[PDB]
Design a protein around this ligand. Sequence first.
Ligand SMILES: CCn1c(NC(C)C)nc2c(-c3cccnc3)csc2c1=O
Ligand SMILES: [Mg+2]
Ligand SMILES: [Zn+2]
Length: 318
Amino acid sequence: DYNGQAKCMLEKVGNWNFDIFLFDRLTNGNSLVSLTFHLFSLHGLIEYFHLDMMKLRRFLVMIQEDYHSQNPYHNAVHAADVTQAMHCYLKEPKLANSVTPWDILLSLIAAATHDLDHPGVNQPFLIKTNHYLATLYKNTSVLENHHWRSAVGLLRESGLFSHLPLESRQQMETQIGALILATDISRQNEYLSLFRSHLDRGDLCLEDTRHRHLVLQMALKCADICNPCRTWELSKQWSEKVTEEFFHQGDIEKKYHLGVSPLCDRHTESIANIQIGFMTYLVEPLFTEWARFSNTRLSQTMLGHVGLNKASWKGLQR
Ligand SMILES: CCn1c(NC(C)C)nc2c(-c3cccnc3)csc2c1=O
Ligand SMILES: [Mg+2]
Ligand SMILES: [Zn+2]
């Protein structure tokens, strides 16, 4: 029965109300591999790049298995969700009419690997505990650099693009890296201001690769924080999961006298308040600029869901 209904759900992979949780349940935890394999096929990439499907499945599996399923939030299902959202944005007319198969290929791989091997604790925690990653990357986008170099290790190991020129492989690594690093939420002000200027100037030229890759970076930043732009039933689950993971980092900081990070203290913070401030200060500003770039039904739908989800969280207060 379950393999049947999964196939059926994928017919609706371009829907904003896709249900990634049911999809992962139906596939016995195989959502990222199964979703992304399908999108590679849907976007024609297996033919366009003469990909061996056996190596494709192996690469996708090494990615999926390199997420920590025991993280409440940062696991392969969040990756699969971000990949499905990215696919919806690639379908928006300004992207659909300018992106190349190569852009589509990098965007999906970057979405799929953007949180690879995430340890379930944030950058200030890794820095203050002297984790080896923080030294390796000199305290700068420590997580994102880790996800990226981990992704480059899987690309090399899989041999999936071994038949393409070395220079193409290197460029793939570099452009994926610029996409993943854009997901460092602590640098949102820099990406959002740059984006907002171009949008004020009206100077973006989507047949220019540099401009188009800045837009793709904005698209991936959207995909990564679009949980509140989903339906209430989806958004509620993501908010519980994200909060569980934050509160767990707080319990460790409390137990070991590490200093409790903002948002991680279960005794002074609530799920509702955490969501409301996140929506006001990070989600709405990004999605309002995004809706100026791509002024479509999808962008309105996304922003209506934020307004609605925000009223729900206020409702659940006093
Ligand atoms: C969409 C999942 N998500 C993420 N994703 C970040 C981790 C990319 N961040 C936050 C924050 C937050 C607020 C302030 C500063 N840093 C994080 C509050 S709620 C929330 C959330 O639901
Ligand atoms: Mg991340
Ligand atoms: Zn993420």
